[model samples]
Target chain A: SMSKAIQQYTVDARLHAVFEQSGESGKSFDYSQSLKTTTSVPEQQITAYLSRIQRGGYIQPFGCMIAVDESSFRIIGYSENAREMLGIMPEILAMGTDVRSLFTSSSSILLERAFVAREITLLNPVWIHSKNTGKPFYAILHRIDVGVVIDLEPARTEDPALSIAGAVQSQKLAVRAISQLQALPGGDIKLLCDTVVESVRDLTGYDRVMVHKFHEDEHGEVVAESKRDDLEPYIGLHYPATDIPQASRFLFKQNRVRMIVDCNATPVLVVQDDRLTQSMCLVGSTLRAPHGCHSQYMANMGSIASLAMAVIINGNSSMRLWGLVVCHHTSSRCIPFPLRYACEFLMQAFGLQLNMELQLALQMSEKRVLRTQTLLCDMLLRDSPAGIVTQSPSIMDLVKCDGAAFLYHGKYYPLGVAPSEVQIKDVVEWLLANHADSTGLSTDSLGDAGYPGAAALGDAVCGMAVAYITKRDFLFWFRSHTAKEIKWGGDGQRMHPRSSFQAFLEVVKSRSQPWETAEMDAIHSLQLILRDSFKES
Target chain B: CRLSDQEYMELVFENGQILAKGQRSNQRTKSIMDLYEAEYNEDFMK
Candidate 1:
């Protein structure tokens, strides 16, 4: 279940934003000074910590987080692994050492500028000189509640394989490496999506890289994919709506990037201090471990590792996630931070580009919209709006739907294949009563979402989208039923995964096709045109 | 709950099934993926 695989990503940035120059919550006290005594940390603190991480727990092996006092800059809270991973001095443990003692003099100045001058937050991998063993390493800085955090990781820039900016400023012309987006044509959604998968495929070297676009129903379709030459094609395949669970969706929205290094490795816990009962806040930590269920679900997809990047855009005065760029590898793979940053940037670039293309597509469709408009007006003024089929088309050519009709005044003008006049009337009653104030209503389950006419609609029409002229006049569009066919590796039908690997194929043909974004947008424009045309007429 | 304008919602259907439900409404809310390197700790590290 993608819902399970999707459980892999998300990081909470809330904790990072809580700390300010004045966020010395509950006294400017030292967690480190208390650590040296008996780390019987505040009891109430651990209770609140548990509730914070309830969405899931987080632990990682490569990097570790350390919280330090904002004023004195001495270590207050440090994860145990970071103590060993950063080669921290044995002497530094008994007495919390000044954090500046861990890095070179030059790098200490940069830290001073960030914390003291408020020059930056979210230091993404700035090259710093490590003092414990004294070498160049990359570290990121952000604040959590009452203190500042240094998340340090070893730099792997010299690996014969991978070699990888200044919001803080350096006066130099930025090099243009991503002219590639310009090299590809725009306006065509498919072509742009294909270009995205191909480039990410080249970058990641994973077996498959797919643009999993979200349908209006939240189910996803693999719109474009690049995979190994021998692998089965994933494009055009559909995944269920439940594939992304409730607890998981928010994570993807808050955190833009995430990856699973290995599905089998167990995540080890980290302590702020030996005696303290308090655990680190893994909720906002980007390196939090994969949820066990997500790990298991990913292995079911036959993937050992994965990286997911969110594609998001701002529209309608709010930010919306369009889909995800998901990459999967058969064997576990290591992706350093620089590569992660590049992928994150690329996905964002695609988001902005996609917004322009989609807007352009909508603007160009006005020609067809006007055609439908003129045709409808001529029929309405000359006679009854019933013979729109004369000379015309499936007539609702602006949108794709199998069945169409309008409940005008007390009569019904029907086209294509529609339900009984009585059944359609029931829907009109429900819409006019409850949803009259809404932009429009689209639902695959007429009886679902508390619709009273669920039984009357039955097989004639499984889904409907509405365009309203007045509280009393309406146009309804419907799509025929769609079934999902899938294969399971094994099922005993009673208890368990089977010992023998047998395949069982099944199909569910009851539901209708979802009313997607394109349908909703088209009907929205049509509704506005119809209602606004003669508010006085 | 009667569906609010939230971007993500539950569409309750027949058979007591709660399937995919998404809203267009404006909507935030972990991480450990690429940043953590997996290592075998001493049995004591647990």
Candidate 2:
């Protein structure tokens, strides 16, 4: 009966013609030339094809695969990075290795041997050797399902001391730049913004650094910025104060440092309180929640994570608000907690210095003139630790100038129109030549201004040419604010003299020179550090 | 009896998981939807 069912198989059309040979019917077939052209299939040909495809793209096939069959666990596939740790291919070492056997035997051994570092874990620096390919690899291993992940990286050949030295030097450089705060005029404060951000980037090797300053309204803006190549510019950007929040600020007042290793993880501390009815700032322990910009904007910018430090200039002054020094990771990079805390500490010192410098500037500004007749020129050229000019002033030395001078310079020279170097030089020469006393109120007197050539020649013999010119009084500099008022943001942190003065006292306690020179040196060092760091990136 | 649209089922969550249900007013629904919209744009980058 089963054989009878097979008869239905032949119920199809038979198109070929048959020729009878001897007593049976047979079909004439050709076998020689055509059959010889067929190609043979190699073993595991698909694997070869897949391996080629995986090599060129950023598909991130480095994750480990865990296989759970019944009670015991085993690693089925190790990432290319993981393969390097084991020194074998998935097809070979994977055969009989138990779940635990898949990873390196000892945590220290793995960490010591690993090439690519993710999170600090056991078998951190796992090395692998492959039977087929002799190439050795290093990887960081992670637990994945029932198996362990072998995240592969190129083998490390450099000395560990080099990395440590670099990290330490970078942090010192950043910290030094930020330590320039003193009671200075607001100009110094403004100048420090960009420099501090640059230091954060250079020290930490992050993609971008943003100085988020609080406005008079208590909102924040990305006022200063230093970014890596092709990074999204955070300058001219704004974030509501709500992002940092009043609750968060209070936390800084106490801890002075908060490092968020992962912005997407759940905060460990509870942020809200349903049990209490009283007023208290509530913060969920973790700030690692995924931000809204993660999917679209930050993705394009290549920022996967961020680390921030709060910088407070003058205490409770309008500029009294918080300043954030932040770094953005371009791709999926794990920023460690120790690194974050270290950055926070350096920024803290820098913030303290900033607070000091701002106050010192205010103190110096107060000594120059009373409210009545003090001119902008007076404030700009006055003598003090806060003055832009070097204490050992010289005609050749470049004096610091700001918006006040910018306005005056533009008025006298009109650089926007006849903006040639000759015109600027001539203008500076004319200003230098004219005597403040003899030059009348008439604009034409600008041409009749006194010449400094004779004075320079006469004063040179005394070794006081630079010194004499530095001592000369100018009117425009008088407009700088040196009042003992606590600044909100408009005048820098110079408004708070006590706090600023206190910083100076501390610097003195460090066995520093007089307040004037010590404070200026501190500020100068900070500016130099910031400039160098900024230039580095 | 006819049920007013204002009286609708509401759900509560604990630790990101659903916990209980209760009756909610139409205003509450609108407010909850508004909250979700704000979070979607600001936190989720939607």
The number of the candidate with the highest lDDT is 1
Q: Write the per-residue lDDT of candidate 2 for residues B3-25, one digit (tens) a residue.
A: 11221122222342323243221
Local error of candidate 1 at residue A233 (angstroms): 3.1
Q: How much does candidate 1 score in TM-score?
A: 0.65
Candidate 2's error at A420, in angstroms?
38
Q: Which regions of candidate 2 deviate over 4 angstroms?
A: A1-187, A238-240, A251-302, A313-321, A364-369, A373-537, B1-46
Please give the lDDT score at residue A165 for candidate 2: 74
Score chain A of model 2 by TM-score against the reference chain A.
Answer: 0.34
lDDT of 2 by residue, A193-307 (tens): 6556665666677767777676543545567778665654546543322223232454354334443333333322112123334211112112212222222234434455666
lDDT of each: 0.60, 0.37
- Candidate 1 lDDT over residue span A1-537, tens digit each: 244322222111122112111144533222122212221223343334234433233566666666787879877676657667667645765336787777787677666655652222333456777777765676766555446667776765454333424321111111122457767666698988887788778766788898888866565667888878887666666654433654456567766787877887777565455654544444446667875445656765578888888999887878887888999898878776656666776777788889999888877776677677676667655764455544465356767777688766777767777877887777777777788677677776665657766665566567778777677777778766564233332222211122111111111243676666756776776677667655746
Residue A155's lDDT within candidate 2 is 40
Measured against the true chain A, the candidates' chain A TM-scores are: 0.69, 0.34
Mind sharing the TM-score for model 2?
0.33
